[PDB]
């Protein structure tokens, strides 16, 4: 029993974290085989950020301008190239701790673990979700750029996020490991803002199934709804529309509790229209939306890596 | 910016997790140097758990009755001993991945990271706190016994918890790494229940200071309170008494924000009376109590967003 915001074990990623310094800018890099991946803004001064021409800044750099530190060892950069908003530094040493990995781009609503790093040294691990507005509600201070987000499947690390920036509302933005931003963000010090966000409906339903598995049933009722009628309510409360794909994905949780998805949707409709009436669900007074259906199945089954 | 329930990176502990099997019972062990530490109830059947005589069950075992698996390698047990509620299995191989470590027994209110494991394989990492009733609100299924709790302040792992049991209310109990239980619990299936739990007041105050550091002050008020009047009020909401030690520990957070501890206590008294009125604090509609003053200083910026 119990239900916690659980992250994947971070050891396989810890063994990849390095420090990258270019001039007075220092941030984190990901060392996989003989390449170190990091945000391309490592080559910018504060003045450059206002309007950087990354190709023009990069052409003026030599390999020896990049200082890469792995623990207490200095790696030698022997090549450099840019891929979208990521810089790839070819080094003379292959990482002996390179895990089996893939670079994957995730969709809004998906969750991942973040290994927060400073000066190439891991500081903590936490779980988060790619918001529908393509931001993440992370916990990052200056120096955390280059920290990565990931998921694990058996022995394979799927890297999905690299940290680049904080927005005025205190939320975060970054790219996949191919350097493509999530969201309409750019790597420059210019006016940028998080768009209006919505609640991830399929994840709230998954967490209500988690509450049922753990013994919280007070919110269940005799009613059902159609997908069309439920979505009228979702639109009214700033919830994402629920699709037939979301209903299908909830199938295993619906089967393991005996509660049809549309039956759980009628419970969610009443919770939105009336509130919790002084009660909590899994120790929360808010409807939690950062657990996917797979996260619920994995935590309620004991899947290992 | 931001504020999350953050665990320590788990790699140093992952390299210590092994599987221990005795007959049909299988659970996790912690392999440090040439010793594997695990719950002594690995030698029990379900029937034995009502009134176990651990000494009598253990004397009938040889070293080769204990199967220890580290990854895909079988370790050889060359000695065994019982220390309180833990079994210490001496093995013929020292763990090459043993980190710098210490065994520390913690007090209620302290937090730690848990590396949940099954069959000697890590499944996830999460943060928790030792509750005032000496239980933890973990996430553990059957097979998770032997999973450990730890902190990693300055590259040394401080192991503070080993998982042994789930209570009828769904909360968890376990020991320090010397096998001494936290709380009045026994590794026997007895009518033992979690005592009435209370909120960790010093941690709620720390989290209110975290909210101020991150730029929010809506909950502050123009009042102060004495320590005794605050305790008289807080205990009516099942909050733990706040001591002068707790006030002292909040000193650095009080200094970074310019808000005296007793003035933050007055704010907490008002939040207990009024609730949040549709507002949230650091993305929560409840008063959070599983962040210590040390955790807030560890995670938050050293510069308040004034
Ligand atoms: N709004 C806002 C801010 C960020 S900023 O405006 O100073 N900023 C714009 C920017 C734009 C694009 C890119 Cl690619 C990078 C960046 C930078 C580069 C430096 C590191 N950083 C930070 C990243 N993460 C967490 C931060 C926590 C405090 C400080 C800076 C942080 C950035 O966001 C700077 C003040 C919180
Ligand atoms: N109430 C209750 C229970 C526990 S029990 O009654 O089955 N139980 C009594 C007991 C007494 C003392 C000691 Cl030291 C150990 C144990 C055991 C040993 C086996 C593993 N286990 C478990 C430990 N952690 C998480 C569990 C999640 C589901 C199942 C069992 C779990 C225990 O608690 C068994 C049913 C949740
Ligand atoms: Cl302590």
Query: What's the rounded Cα separation, in Å, for the pair B140 and B116?
Result: 7
For A226, half-sphere exposure in the C-beta direction (CA atoms, 13 angstrom radius) is 3
CB A208 within 8 A of CB A264: yes
Secondary structure element (H or E) that encloses residue A90, with its range: strand A86-91
Q: Is the CB of A164 under 6 A from ligand 1?
A: yes
CA-wise closest residue to A182 among A163, A198, A204, A157: A163
Tokens of A27: 């941030």
Which residues, at least 6 apart from A53, have a Cβ–Cβ distance to it below 8 Å? none
Q: Using alpha carbons only, give the angle B19, B21, B27 rounded to the nearest 5 degrees.
A: 55
3-state secondary structure of B30: strand
Query: What's the rounded Cα separation, in Å, for the pair A299 and B222?
Result: 45
Asked if B11 and A8 come within 8 Å (Cβ–Cβ), the reply is no
Which residues, at least 6 apart from B241, have a Cβ–Cβ distance to it below 8 Å? B201, B231, B234, B235
Note the maximum CA span of chain B: 69
Burial of A255 (0-12, 13-18, 19+ CB in 10 A): exposed
Pairing relationship of beta strands B86-91 and B66-70 according to DSSP bridges:
unpaired
Query: What's the rounded Cα separation, in Å, for the pair B64 and B68?
Result: 10
> Residues B244, B250, B254, B255: is their CA dihedral positive or negative?
positive
Asked if A140 and B1 come within 8 Å (Cβ–Cβ), the reply is yes
Indicate the DSSP class of residue A187. S
Burial B145-183, CB ≥16 within 10 A → b, else e: bbbbbbbbeeeebbbbbbbbbbbeebbbbbbbbebebbb
Give which of A3, A10, A142 to mutate to test B binding, by max B Cβ within 10 Å: A10
Q: Using alpha carbons only, give the angle B202, A207, B133 rounded to the nearest 5 degrees.
A: 30
Tokens of B268: 């907490």
3-state secondary structure of A96: coil
CB B231 within 8 A of CB B242: yes
Query: What's the rounded Cα separation, in Å, for the pair B302 and B299?
Result: 9
B278: how many CB neighbours lie within 10 A of its CB? 6
CA-wise closest residue to B139 among B125, B121, B119, B157: B125
Q: How distant, in Å, are the alpha carbons of A193, A261, B226 from that of B243?
A: 44, 49, 12
- The answer for A 151-170 residues in CB contact with B (under 8 A) is 166, 170
Closest ligand 2 atom, residue A1 Cα? 27
CB B35 within 8 A of CB A152: no
Question: Which residues in chain B touch residue A215, judged by CB atoms under 8 angstroms apart?
Answer: 170
Rounded to the nearest angstrom, the distance between the alpha carbon of B165 and the centre of ligand 3 is 21
Pairing relationship of beta strands B121-129 and B35-39 according to DSSP bridges:
unpaired
Counting one residue from chain A and one from chain B, the pairs whose CB atoms sit within 8 A come to 134
Query: What's the rounded Cα separation, in Å, for the pair A82 and B22?
Result: 55
CB B63 within 8 A of CB B119: no
CB B147 within 8 A of CB B115: yes
- The answer for B 17-76 residues in CB contact with A (under 8 A) is none
- The answer for B 201-240 residues in CB contact with A (under 8 A) is 214-215
Query: What's the rounded Cα separation, in Å, for the pair A272 and B291?
Result: 30
Query: What's the rounded Cα separation, in Å, for the pair A255 and A94?
Result: 47
Tokens of A124: 């903590």
Q: How distant, in Å, are the alpha carbons of B88, B97, B189 from that of B179?
A: 10, 23, 17
Phi, psi of B215 (to 5 degrees): 105, 10
Asked if B140 and A2 come within 8 Å (Cβ–Cβ), the reply is yes
Shortest alpha-carbon distance between residue B2 and chain A (Å)? 4
CA-wise closest residue to A204 among A256, A170, A246: A246
Shortest alpha-carbon distance between residue A299 and chain B (Å)? 8
Q: Counting every residue, how long is chain A?
A: 305
B78: how many CB neighbours lie within 10 A of its CB? 13
Asked if B11 and A9 come within 8 Å (Cβ–Cβ), the reply is yes
* A35-39: strand order across its sheet: A73-75, A66-70, A17-22, A25-32, A35-39, A86-91, A77-83
| Ranges assigned E (strand) in chain B | 17-22, 25-32, 35-39, 66-70, 73-75, 77-83, 86-91, 101-103, 111-118, 121-129, 148-151, 157-166, 172-175
**Which residues line the pocket of ligand 2, CB cutoff 6 A?**
A 1; B 41, 49, 140-142, 144-145, 164-168, 187, 189
Phi, psi of A4 (to 5 degrees): -120, 160
Shortest alpha-carbon distance between residue A283 and chain B (Å)? 9
Question: Which residues in chain A touch residue B125, judged by CB atoms under 8 angstroms apart?
Answer: 6-10, 125
Q: Using alpha carbons only, give the angle A294, B141, A158 rounded to the nearest 5 degrees.
A: 35
Rounded to the nearest angstrom, the distance between the alpha carbon of B255 and the centre of ligand 1 is 26
Task: Please report the resolution in angstroms.
Answer: 1.5
Q: For B6, which of A6, A139, A304 is closest by C-beta distance?
A: A139
Query: What's the rounded Cα separation, in Å, for the pair A60 and A52?
Result: 13
Which residues, at least 6 apart from B37, have a Cβ–Cβ distance to it below 8 Å? B29, B30, B86, B87, B88, B89, B162, B177
Q: Is the CB of A48 under 6 A from ligand 1?
A: no
Secondary structure element (H or E) that encloses residue B299, with its range: helix B293-299
Tokens of A302: 């004991």
A193/B contact by beta carbon, under 8 A? no
Pairing relationship of beta strands A100-103 and A156-166 according to DSSP bridges:
parallel
Tokens of A189: 């010090």
Asked if B5 and A5 come within 8 Å (Cβ–Cβ), the reply is yes
Query: What's the rounded Cα separation, in Å, for the pair B135 and A200?
Result: 33
CB A220 within 8 A of CB A267: yes
CB A265 within 8 A of CB A205: yes
Question: Which residues in chain A touch residue B124, judged by CB atoms under 8 angstroms apart?
Answer: 6-9, 299
Residues of B annotated as catalytic are: 41, 145
Which domains does chain B carry? 1-14+100-197 (2.40.10.10), 15-99 (2.40.10.10), 198-301 (1.10.1840.10)
Instruction: Output the DSSP codes for B184-248.
Output: S--SS--S--PPPP-B-HHHHHHHHHHHHHTT--TT--S----HHHHHHHHGGGTBPPP-HHHHH
Report H helices in chain A.
Answer: 11-14, 46-49, 54-59, 201-213, 227-236, 244-249, 251-257, 261-274, 293-299
CA-wise closest residue to B100 among B162, B155, B177, B178: B155
CB B253 within 8 A of CB B209: yes
> Residues B50, B55, B59, B61: is their CA dihedral positive or negative?
positive
Instruction: Identify how the structure was determined.
Output: X-ray
A138: how many CB neighbours lie within 10 A of its CB? 24
């Amino acid at each position: 029993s119990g239900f916690r915001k659980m992250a994947f074990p971070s050891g396989k990623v810890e063994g990849c974290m390095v420090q990258v310094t270019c001039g007075t800018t220092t941030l984190n890099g990901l060392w996989l085989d003989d390449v170190v991946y990091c945000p391309r803004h490592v080559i910018c001064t504060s003045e450059d950020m206002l309007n950087p021409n990354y190709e023009d800044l990069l052409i003026r750099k030599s390999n020896h301008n990049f200082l890469v530190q792995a623990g207490n060892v200095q790696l030698r950069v022997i090549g450099h190239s840019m891929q979208n908003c990521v810089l790839k530094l070819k080094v003379d040493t292959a990482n002996p701790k390179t895990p089996k990995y893939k670079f994957v781009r995730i969709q809004p609503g998906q969750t991942f673990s973040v290994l927060a790093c400073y000066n190439g040294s891991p500081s903590g691990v936490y779980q988060c979700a790619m918001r529908p507005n393509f931001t993440i509600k992370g916990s990052f201070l200056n120096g955390s750029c280059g920290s990565v987000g990931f998921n694990i499947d058996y022995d394979c690390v799927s890297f999905c996020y690299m940290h680049h920036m904080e927005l005025p509302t205190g939320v975060h933005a970054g790219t996949d490991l191919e350097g493509n931003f999530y969201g309409p963000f750019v790597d420059r010090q210019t006016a940028q803002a998080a768009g209006t966000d919505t609640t991830i409906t399929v994840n709230v339903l998954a967490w209500l199934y988690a509450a049922v598995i753990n013994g919280d049933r007070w919110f269940l009722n005799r009613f059902t709804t159609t997908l069309n009628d439920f979505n009228l309510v979702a639109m009214k409360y700033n919830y994402e529309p629920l699709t037939q794909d979301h209903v299908d994905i909830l199938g295993p949780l619906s089967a393991q509790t005996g509660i049809a998805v549309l039956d759980m949707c009628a419970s969610l409709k009443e919770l939105l229209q009336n509130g919790m009436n002084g009660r909590t669900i899994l120790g929360s007074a808010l409807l939690e939306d950062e657990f996917t259906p797979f996260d619920v199945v994995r935590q309620c089954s004991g899947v290992t890596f």
